[PDB]
Amino acid sequence: VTGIYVKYWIYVCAGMFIVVSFAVYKIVYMFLFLLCLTLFQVYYTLWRKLLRVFWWLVVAYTMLVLIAVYTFQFQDFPTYWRNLTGFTDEQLGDLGLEQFSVSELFSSILIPGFFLLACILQLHYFHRPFMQLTDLRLLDLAASFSAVLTRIQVFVRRLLELHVFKLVALYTVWVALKEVSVMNLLLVVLWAFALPYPRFRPMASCLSTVWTCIIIVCKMLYQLKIVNPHNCTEPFPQPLEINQSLLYRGPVDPANWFGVRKGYPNLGYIQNHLQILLLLVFEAVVYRRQEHYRRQHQQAPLPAQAVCADGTRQRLDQDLLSCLKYFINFFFYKFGLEICFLMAVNVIGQRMNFMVILHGCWLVAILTRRRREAIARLWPNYCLFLTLFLLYQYLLCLGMPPALCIDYPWRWSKAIPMNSALIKWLYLPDFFRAPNSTNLISDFLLLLCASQQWQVFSAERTEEWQRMAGINTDHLEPLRGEPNPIPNFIHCRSYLDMLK
Numbered sequence: 001v002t003g004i005y006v007k008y009w010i011y012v013c014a015g016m017f018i019v020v021s022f023a024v025y026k027i028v029y030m031f032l033f034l035l036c037l038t039l040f041q042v043y044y045t046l047w048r049k050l051l052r053v054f055w056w057l058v059v060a061y062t063m064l065v066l067i068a069v070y071t072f073q074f075q076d077f078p079t080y081w082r083n084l085t086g087f088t089d090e091q092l093g094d095l096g097l098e099q100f101s102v103s104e105l106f107s108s109i110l111i112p113g114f115f116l117l118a119c120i121l122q123l124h125y126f127h128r129p130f131m132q133l134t135d136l137r138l139l140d141l142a143a144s145f146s147a148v149l150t151r152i153q154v155f156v157r158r159l160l161e162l163h164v165f166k167l168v169a170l171y172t173v174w175v176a177l178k179e180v181s182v183m184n185l186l187l188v189v190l191w192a193f194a195l196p197y198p199r200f201r202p203m204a205s206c207l208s209t210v211w212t213c214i215i216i217v218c219k220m221l222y223q224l225k226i227v228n229p230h231n232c233t234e235p236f237p238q239p240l241e242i243n244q245s246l247l248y249r250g251p252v253d254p255a256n257w258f259g260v261r262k263g264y265p266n267l268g269y270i271q272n273h274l275q276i277l278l279l280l281v282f283e284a285v286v287y288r289r290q291e292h293y294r295r296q297h298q299q300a301p302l303p304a305q306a307v308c309a310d311g312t313r314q315r316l317d318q319d320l321l322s323c324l325k326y327f328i329n330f331f332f333y334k335f336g337l338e339i340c341f342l343m344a345v346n347v348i349g350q351r352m353n354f355m356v357i358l359h360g361c362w363l364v365a366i367l368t369r370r371r372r373e374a375i376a377r378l379w380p381n382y383c384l385f386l387t388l389f390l391l392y393q394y395l396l397c398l399g400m401p402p403a404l405c406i407d408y409p410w411r412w413s414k415a416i417p418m419n420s421a422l423i424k425w426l427y428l429p430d431f432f433r434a435p436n437s438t439n440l441i442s443d444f445l446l447l448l449c450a451s452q453q454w455q456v457f458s459a460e461r462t463e464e465w466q467r468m469a470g471i472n473t474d475h476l477e478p479l480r481g482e483p484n485p486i487p488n489f490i491h492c493r494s495y496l497d498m499l500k
Contacts, residue, residue, distance in 0.1 A: 008129045010054075013122045014039075017057075018274075020111045022267045026095035028064055030220050035060065037213035040281050044209045047288075048134065051126045058119035065112050071097035072105075090224050133288075135295060158307045161290055165205070166448055168279045169195060172208070173444045175272040177437045180397060181259035183218070186211050187276075188394050192387045192444075195451035209280045212273050215259070219270050222262040230254050232405040238413060239420060239432065246431035247402055254403035304465035306330065313470050317486055320496045330469040336449070336456040337375070341367070343446040350439045354426040355393065359446075372474055376457050383450045390440075390447055397437055399429040407431075 014036065021032045035057050042050060071079075076096055080087035087093060099105045169191045176184045187208060194204035234248035243249055253260065263269035290299055301309035311325035332339065344363050348356055362382060369375050400406055408430055410423060424433045459465065459472070477483040492498040 016118045238411040252402045257401045340449045396429045
């Protein structure tokens with residue numbers, strides 16, 4: 001058969017490290033996650049050195065298997081003697097391979113038992129895999145439908161070349177708002193400047209690969225240091241059940257404002273940033289796969305970024321199929337401002353708060369300027385105010401930290417006390433009625449749509465892609481002998497013209 005070219009991928013070797021990282025709760029397990037994070041950052045920095053890195057990872061897994069092998073007998077007492085006054089029965093004893101010798105020792109020996117064999121397999125197959133990832137009526141229907149699958153493969157890959165930085169940005173904000181969990185405010189800041197700014201796109205992805213792995217280590221390193229060394233007795237004279245919700249009810253974890261909660265599954269607390277790091281590495285993989293095709297052929301289909309380059313502005317008036325291709329690759333090109341106005345209404349749709357009154361008022365400040373140029377004279381100023389408004393919105397819900405028992409200044413009530421809903425309708429950062437940030441993802445969508453609307457406004461400046469999908473000025477032709485940019489279409493003689 002000789003079909004061993006599919007069994008040369010390092011993805012199973014990467015997944016075995018995380019499968020051995022979970023279950024367990026030792027300090028040796030952080031070394032495997034630091035190795036996967038360093039390999040991910042090496043995938044975001046420079047290739048052609050991961051073979052020796054995998055050899056050192058096999059050496060580190062061999063050292064971990066040797067550390068598990070040395071603690072089979074009663075040598076931990078000698079390890080506590082050899083420890084330079086740092087054993088303390090948990091600094092070297094909890095993570096020091098407490099052998100149960102029934103089934104936990106079997107699980108802890110079989111966890112690295114597959115990883116060591118996968119390390120030897122990756123050491124034997126590192127030369128063939130670095131050859132592809134570098135600079136080098138049955139059979140007829142099977143080959144033809146496989147060729148159709150390769151056409152769909154290039155179609156999906158070209159559509160997944162772009163439109164993934166938006167998807168990674170959506171998932172990072174979905175993470176950073178479903179769980180607020182500050183120290184991911186750097187992710188909110190980096191992506192809210194990655195979307196409008198063109199040159200900051202590859203710089204923010206690399207820094208996100210750095211800072212998320214910092215958060216991964218800072219969400220792994222909580223095993224033994226308990227909450228009790230690291231609250232808020234109530235003043236009884238603003239609502240009646242004010243001593244039930246956040247501050248003056250429970251002892252406030254001071255690092256919970258910094259995003260520290262040691263959970264019981266020990267992966268489900270970390271699935272969010274793990275999937276963020278997977279999407280960042282996959283975002284790197286897709287662009288590298290584009291240069292893997294660029295070594296053989298071209299990756300400039302059109303001047304503007306596009307899929308299925310056959311559909312022109314002129315081939316648009318031919319058939320249903322070219323019209324479908326044209327409104328695949330230039331749909332947001334033509335109908336961008338309409339979608340941006342709709343997503344502004346979407347923000348007003350789910351929120352209906354006091355700070356979205358700003359969105360309605362600046363929407364009228366756009367829509368009174370009727371023409372496109374009168375919008376374009378103020379559109380970058382509004383988009384920069386928009387991303388500053390989103391960062392202002394995420395800086396709110398914080399105020400002062402809950403570790404400090406000092407309170408928000410709205411129990412003083414300004415001598416006219418408001419209820420628990422006016423502090424919710426107005427976006428007050430409080431602790432009883434916690435203001436919702438999961439409804440802010442529509443506002444991040446609106447920031448995304450205005451971000452690529454900058455490139456749609458740059459199309460009026462650039463002649464560079466006015467051949468395919470030409471001008472979109474809102475000025476028709478009066479006082480004209482014959483305008484005729486399109487032939488007379490009132491009578492059908494087609495299928496696309498009947499729809500037209």
